[PDB]
Amino acid sequence: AAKDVKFGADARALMLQGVDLLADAVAVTMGPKGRTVIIEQSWGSPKVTKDGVTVAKSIDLKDKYKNIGAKLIQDVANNTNEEAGDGTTTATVLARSIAKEGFEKISKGANPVEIRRGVMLAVDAVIAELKKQSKPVTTPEEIAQVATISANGDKEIGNIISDAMKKVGRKGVITVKDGKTLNDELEIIEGMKFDRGYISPYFINTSKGQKCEFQDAYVLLSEKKISSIQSIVPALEIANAHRKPLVIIAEDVDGEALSTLVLNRLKVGLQVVAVKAPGFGDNRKNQLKDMAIATGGAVFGEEGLTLNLEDVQPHDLGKVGEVIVTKDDAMLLKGKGDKAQIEKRIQEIIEQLDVTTSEYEKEKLNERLAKLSDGVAVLKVGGTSDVEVNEKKDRVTDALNATRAAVEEGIVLGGGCALLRCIPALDSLTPANEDQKIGIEIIKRTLKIPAMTIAKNAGVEGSLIVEKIMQSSSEVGYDAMAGDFVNMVEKGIIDPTKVVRTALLDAAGVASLLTTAEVVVTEIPK
Amino acid sequence: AAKDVKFGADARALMLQGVDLLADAVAVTMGPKGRTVIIEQSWGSPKVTKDGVTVAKSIDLKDKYKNIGAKLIQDVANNTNEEAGDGTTTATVLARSIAKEGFEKISKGANPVEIRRGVMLAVDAVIAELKKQSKPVTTPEEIAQVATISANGDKEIGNIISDAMKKVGRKGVITVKDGKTLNDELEIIEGMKFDRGYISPYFINTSKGQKCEFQDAYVLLSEKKISSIQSIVPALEIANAHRKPLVIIAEDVDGEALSTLVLNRLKVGLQVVAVKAPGFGDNRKNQLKDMAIATGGAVFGEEGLTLNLEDVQPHDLGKVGEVIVTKDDAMLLKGKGDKAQIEKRIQEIIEQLDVTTSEYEKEKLNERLAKLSDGVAVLKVGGTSDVEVNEKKDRVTDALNATRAAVEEGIVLGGGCALLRCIPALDSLTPANEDQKIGIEIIKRTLKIPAMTIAKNAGVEGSLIVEKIMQSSSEVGYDAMAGDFVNMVEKGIIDPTKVVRTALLDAAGVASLLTTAEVVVTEIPK
Amino acid sequence: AAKDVKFGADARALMLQGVDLLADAVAVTMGPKGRTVIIEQSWGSPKVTKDGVTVAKSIDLKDKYKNIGAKLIQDVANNTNEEAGDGTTTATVLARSIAKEGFEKISKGANPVEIRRGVMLAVDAVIAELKKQSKPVTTPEEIAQVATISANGDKEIGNIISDAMKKVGRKGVITVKDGKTLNDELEIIEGMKFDRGYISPYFINTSKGQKCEFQDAYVLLSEKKISSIQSIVPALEIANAHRKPLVIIAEDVDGEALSTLVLNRLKVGLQVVAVKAPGFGDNRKNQLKDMAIATGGAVFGEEGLTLNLEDVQPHDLGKVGEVIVTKDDAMLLKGKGDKAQIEKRIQEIIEQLDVTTSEYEKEKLNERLAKLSDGVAVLKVGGTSDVEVNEKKDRVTDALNATRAAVEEGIVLGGGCALLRCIPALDSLTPANEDQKIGIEIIKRTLKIPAMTIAKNAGVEGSLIVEKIMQSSSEVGYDAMAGDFVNMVEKGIIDPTKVVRTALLDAAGVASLLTTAEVVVTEIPK
């Protein structure tokens, strides 16, 4: 493919146009009063949504240089904010204005690097202030209040979340399922969780939410790589002989092993998924052994006693009641196994904790201890019929994720005020020269945009609302639902600090790249 | 295909336009302050890079004559500088300006040959001066300091490199591997190195870095060609019967043997690679014998006892714990064999060294001694997770290559000063006539470009920085990171003389061709 | 295909334009100072060359009438000068100007035939003068000096050539091979040479240089044609059963026999080549018998004892250590056979020579004597490694071919002076009428072009150099490398008379056709 190369301002100006269309398209859905976007679909009715992420993913421009401006934001704002849809819109709106103000100052003669440095300095001063203003959420009473708020007044949802948090801990594991009954209930089961997801999208099942879930599955554990290695078939034969799903845990999967596994999933209907091993080095080996004990299988290693994948017997694969694999996450619930062997392994880990003094080893040993001795909390959602249970299910998972975020980093005044109230933090920030001063002023002004954007979608003058907040006491913000100026703490209108802080960093990150890149290379279409 | 022939200046002017676009695109990435280039990709996100080689390879123009200007540089600057990505950008930028200044003087009436001769004379005067200014790096302390510098302050990397250099020698062999542990460490193992790589790109495996690696492989040795000769299958059958990779070392591979090996690699997934034999004539036979002894195999020769490829037994192939094949390089580590036979061969080589007096034989024979008596140093890179081990791994290989280059030819003031400080070398250089004088003056001026280009990317006036360096003492240059005039020796800002010297020769080479070629023939598109 | 017919000057004018582009494109590479031509290639880098033949073959114009002008020269100048690349450029440059001057005089009213006759008369006067000025090269000292000169000062190359010439004679056979060692050396081996090449291009192997080489091959001999005759398979079956290449020598090969042989060469990989029989009539039969004796095979003839191709036994095919087949040439080296039978045949030939008195029979019979009693000289080229041995190999073959040409017809002052110094030969040449006078003057002027073309590529005024040569003594020419007027004999700057003479005839031949053809018929494109 032949290329067309643009330089300097000629390329930057086009990328910025791609960004403005995208930012305007998603800014409109921002806040309690966001408006709808109608997205044409090729097979059915138009899709009508208020979701900032859906709208952002839907837009794809035809011009080759404007397409880049749109992707530089979409590939960051949509990918780094997978937990909730709040951070994507905020990061897109701030990135657009930071980059635009930078571009204008640069095309008039300011130095691109010195402007970038002034912006970095301002972003760090603001973040330090957010950390200082953030309040912790660790007390069961505080957790319940946040859960009730993120549950939008549904106290019953807030209560089952608070109760699950109390029973397995602030750092424990809580999941949500359909209870097939009328009432909501909490049960604790045996299981383990590790940070490794599916190796490939080809194994997605139950596609709503991009999940991969199987029951009564075989568990194959390997220390060795199976990339371009076959002889995985005896495990597949057992899975076919005894109609059970199969999950493969391996250091890596590629080549022929991947080809075999995916083609069977697609052409045979074999319910098989592969996931990467949970650790590194020696710790990887120890985690696979704990898993084998917990699932009643064997580890196909080469050191000591050698067990090869070329010969897999029914007693070498483990058995798991329920297995869940999602992007970058996997769980094995209700495993089968010898309880004496599980307790023995637990006791060995405890002895190692009592003996070692290194921080590294104590932490790794504590993770392995917990994976065998702790349970998993399960929140069962009930209701009259499945069409209603299925909606309540999401209200519970949203309240739960918001609760966990609040607990991990604390909470700040929401509705755009967390950043608006950090503007004074820049008054003591001193630049080395005029271009750094301009860079600080660029952030000083973009800190006011979230507040004005929400007021604008609400239907009131953005300028007056944001100025009135700035001129009043710190606890007062503007409530777009109430149409007034209220005490935000008393009303319970809060945003996790984690989200506010990340959206600011993501915006600064993309805008920085976008205003200093000098050469842009695109393909010539045919 | 019909052709379109352009003559003289009409063709040269178009090639130069192809060159200017390319040179401007990569000049901007030069130095500590290089700016980014955004390269559109057809399947995923835009690629954002600062790498001069990637940018140069990415650009491909549609015009038939401008395409040639771009390829005359890309096919030389990228191909002669495979060792490191440092020298490619300098050669591109210097070639552009040397050729441009030549063209302008020629189109105004200067003689193309006499201008070329003046340029050659100036390049040689400069190189002689670089050799005179370069300082050696041979002392363990000097080596450690250079390694620390090229490691960018990572003193721990500099130390494992210095230690490996000391143990196997300045000219020894050092490789880098993932240690699967927390600490960095060095061990010495048995192995051989020879300068022959894969015969074909179709055998590339583990494609990042264009490598080709196998473990527990069979080795087939042949003094004879296998071009258009089959009956290589019994070795392939053993490799399939006993699932082991195979490496074939032969004088040449073509026809059916090549077809069989490549098609199986691509359509079957047979793990087989072919490599050209390591020597020439009698020395080739002696090297294959040493190798057979070290790997525990046999050479399929015709002289003395005849062994034919038609019948390959399990004891005829050698066995190597790890086989590495890369472009123009191959290595066999951890071979299996009879230690008594290896020592006996070593003792025979020593006696032969004591007897022979010819320079040729002593040097070749000493290399064969070392291949059996010396080991291979392996630097294992550790860490808490593979995502971090993999990054440190690059810092180690870059520091290691930079160290070796410094040791082979010495070091010069970096940052463009090595060439800027050679300008006075041309004051004693006397031309025969006016056109030779012009050619000398062309180099006199292009010697200042690397210094101005870095200052420009830094953001300061190029003209003032370069003139200030010229008016100061010999050890003072401009530090783009510090933003000031510093003593470069004290700061440790250095460049291998080998790189500076090659980039100047390559630039002179391409520019010379480009300004004297008279007729250019291109195809007519359809 | 419909045709478009052009008449007279309208067609001639277009062919001449095709010629001018071609002649200008290759004239530029002429002489010691030839400039480069860059030829675009569709798969890799641009090819940069100074070779007049490559450039001439590369150019192919799209216009239907200009394409003819280009092919009338390419199909002669490239085809009649297969021995060396010197004659093609000279013939192209002279043909262009002879034809152009003719055309201009004709379009102004001169008679095309009378102009052609004046040109023929001038060409013959010049050739007679070249023969008179040519000096012989027959003395071992003279041969060594020429070989050293064509070897460009490499005295060692000149010496191995002189030594081979002395041992097998001025008219003997000398070939060049890779010695697989460091030194150059000469050995004499048993073998035969005959003037018949491959029957088809499909049998080309080892394609660099368009060769076809096999070792340990079977030889099938037939006095009879095998065109459209099958039953050649039993010889092919033996060749497959006993893995040996096969060479077939027959009066002719076509139809089914050729189809079988080519398709097996291309689709099966059967290593077989076919060659036309070496003689005519009775002499053909005698040569095949001498060959059968020398190779240890039999001739499949019908007279006397009948031997049919239907049944070929292992003892009917001959055996040759090495078989070489090239365009219009074939060689059999190291044949196997009964030495008593070979000597007996030699003695019979000697007795027959003593008896016969006819010139025809003595000459043909003496050639057959030599084929059995003389050997073949082989020059082994050595060096450190194959990449360097392979280059020296061509320097040796070029020196060797130049030596042989000099010996066959003598040498003349080179650098364009051989023809420039023949101009006075035309002063006594008397035309019958004005148009013949014009034709003589056309050659008188084109005789000066080679000298001016070289001076022009050197970079000096062509007019002054050629006039100064003409005004000086006969031994003085202009040395483009030295940049001065020198004694060419003392410097050793010489050209074979054979080359100078042929290039003039070829130029006159094409230009003559080109200016008198009257009607040109081309196809109408669609």
Side-chain angles (χ1 to χ4, degrees), chain A residues 126-195:
Chain A
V126 171
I127 292 168
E129 185 66 21
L130 289 168
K131 288 180 178 179
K132 289 178 182 178
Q133 293 183 20
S134 175
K135 302 294 187 182
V137 182
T138 63
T139 302
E141 293 177 354
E142 292 168 334
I143 294 167
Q145 185 64 51
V146 170
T148 300
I149 291 166
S150 67
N152 298 317
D154 182 337
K155 289 179 180 179
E156 291 179 358
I157 292 171
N159 288 335
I160 64 175
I161 292 167
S162 180
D163 192 61
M165 289 287 283
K166 183 176 179 180
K167 286 187 170 65
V168 299
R170 288 190 291 268
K171 303 296 186 183
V173 179
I174 303 167
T175 188
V176 180
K177 299 187 184 181
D178 182 340
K180 300 183 181 179
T181 189
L182 300 176
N183 294 318
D184 293 337
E185 188 59 283
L186 172 63
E187 297 181 16
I188 308 301
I189 57 96
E190 185 176 1
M192 58 187 177
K193 180 175 187 294
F194 61 97
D195 55 313

Side-chain angles (χ1 to χ4, degrees), chain B residues 137-177 184-188 376-381 391-408:
Chain B
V137 182
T138 63
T139 302
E141 179 64 20
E142 292 169 335
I143 294 167
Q145 291 175 11
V146 170
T148 300
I149 292 166
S150 68
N152 298 317
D154 185 335
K155 289 180 179 179
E156 290 176 349
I157 291 172
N159 287 335
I160 65 175
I161 292 168
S162 180
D163 192 61
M165 289 287 282
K166 183 176 179 180
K167 286 187 170 66
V168 299
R170 287 189 289 269
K171 296 181 179 179
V173 180
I174 302 168
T175 66
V176 180
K177 296 288 183 180
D184 294 336
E185 62 180 355
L186 169 66
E187 68 180 4
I188 309 302
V376 177
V378 180
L379 297 170
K380 290 182 177 176
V381 180
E391 182 177 0
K392 186 171 182 181
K393 182 179 176 184
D394 287 338
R395 292 200 304 277
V396 174
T397 58
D398 288 344
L400 180 60
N401 287 340
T403 298
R404 290 169 66 85
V407 171
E408 290 172 355

Side-chain angles (χ1 to χ4, degrees), chain B residues 23 56 58 66 154 196 206 227 229 270 320 417 483 495 498-499:
Chain B
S58 181
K66 296 179 187 183
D154 185 335
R196 297 289 183 272
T206 64
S227 295
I229 298 166
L270 182 66
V320 176
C417 294
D495 290 310
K498 182 169 73 171
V499 173

Side-chain angles (χ1 to χ4, degrees), chain B residues 1-3 5 7 15 64 68 71-72 75 111 256 276 280-281 310 360 513 517-524, chain C residues 21 24-25 28 35-40 42 45-46 58 60 62 180-182 243 269 383-386 389 459:
Chain B
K3 308 292 174 72
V5 181
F7 294 81
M15 291 188 288
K64 295 293 185 182
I68 291 169
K71 293 296 187 184
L72 291 168
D75 292 332
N111 184 298
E256 289 80 2
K276 179 174 178 180
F280 179 77
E310 192 170 11
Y360 179 86
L513 187 151
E518 189 69 31
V519 180
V520 178
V521 182
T522 60
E523 297 181 3
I524 296 168
Chain C
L21 188 150
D24 289 346
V28 77
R35 301 180 187 183
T36 62
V37 179
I38 301 169
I39 300 170
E40 185 186 26
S42 66
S45 67
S58 181
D60 190 357
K62 71 179 183 180
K180 299 183 181 179
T181 189
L182 301 176
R243 296 188 298 272
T384 299
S385 64
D386 52 329
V389 172

Side-chain angles (χ1 to χ4, degrees), chain A residues 182-391:
Chain A
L182 300 176
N183 294 318
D184 293 337
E185 188 59 283
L186 172 63
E187 297 181 16
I188 308 301
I189 57 96
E190 185 176 1
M192 58 187 177
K193 180 175 187 294
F194 61 97
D195 55 313
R196 297 289 183 272
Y198 49 82
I199 66 173
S200 177
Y202 277 118
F203 299 111
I204 296 296
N205 203 329
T206 64
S207 66
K208 183 179 179 182
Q210 296 291 293
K211 303 289 182 265
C212 184
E213 180 176 358
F214 306 102
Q215 302 184 331
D216 195 21
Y218 282 115
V219 182
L220 175 65
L221 306 174
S222 177
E223 290 171 351
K224 189 176 183 180
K225 292 182 181 181
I226 59 172
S227 295
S228 300
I229 298 166
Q230 294 179 347
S231 298
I232 62 168
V233 170
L236 298 173
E237 288 173 350
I238 292 167
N240 280 287
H242 299 276
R243 305 303 296 168
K244 294 185 187 290
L246 173 68
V247 55
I248 297 97
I249 310 300
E251 179 174 13
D252 203 0
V253 181
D254 207 335
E256 292 296 302
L258 181 59
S259 180
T260 297
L261 294 167
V262 171
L263 291 171
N264 286 335
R265 180 264 180 278
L266 297 172
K267 295 183 179 182
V268 174
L270 181 67
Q271 302 299 295
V272 63
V273 61
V275 176
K276 292 187 179 182
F280 177 80
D282 55 334
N283 283 259
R284 181 180 293 156
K285 292 174 185 172
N286 287 337
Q287 290 171 340
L288 289 169
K289 289 179 182 181
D290 287 345
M291 290 174 74
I293 293 168
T295 62
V299 180
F300 288 76
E302 292 183 345
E303 294 181 342
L305 179 65
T306 298
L307 178 68
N308 294 332
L309 292 167
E310 70 193 350
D311 184 354
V312 180
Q313 297 294 310
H315 59 262
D316 295 309
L317 299 172
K319 287 92 192 162
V320 56
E322 303 182 0
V323 54
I324 301 167
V325 180
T326 72
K327 179 183 178 290
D328 298 322
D329 190 79
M331 297 183 76
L332 278 88
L333 282 79
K334 299 181 181 178
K336 304 298 184 183
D338 184 353
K339 298 295 187 183
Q341 292 177 45
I342 293 166
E343 187 65 25
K344 181 178 184 292
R345 185 82 266 278
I346 290 168
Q347 291 298 323
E348 289 177 357
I349 293 166
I350 293 167
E351 289 178 354
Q352 289 177 304
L353 285 165
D354 287 345
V355 175
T356 189
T357 63
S358 297
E359 295 82 2
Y360 179 87
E361 292 183 355
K362 286 187 286 189
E363 289 178 353
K364 292 294 185 184
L365 285 165
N366 283 332
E367 289 179 352
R368 285 192 287 275
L369 180 64
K371 293 183 198 315
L372 296 176
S373 64
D374 288 340
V376 178
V378 180
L379 296 170
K380 293 184 180 182
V381 178
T384 300
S385 64
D386 52 330
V387 74
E388 294 186 353
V389 172
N390 287 338
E391 184 177 355

Side-chain angles (χ1 to χ4, degrees), chain B residues 292-294 296-297 337-347 372:
Chain B
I293 293 167
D338 184 355
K339 68 183 182 181
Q341 292 176 47
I342 293 166
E343 187 65 25
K344 182 177 184 292
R345 184 81 268 277
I346 290 168
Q347 291 298 322
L372 297 177

Side-chain angles (χ1 to χ4, degrees), chain A residues 94 97-98 101 441-450:
Chain A
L94 290 170
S97 292
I98 294 166
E101 290 289 299
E441 289 179 352
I442 291 168
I443 293 298
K444 191 171 186 177
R445 290 191 297 277
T446 60
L447 290 171
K448 293 184 176 179
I449 293 165

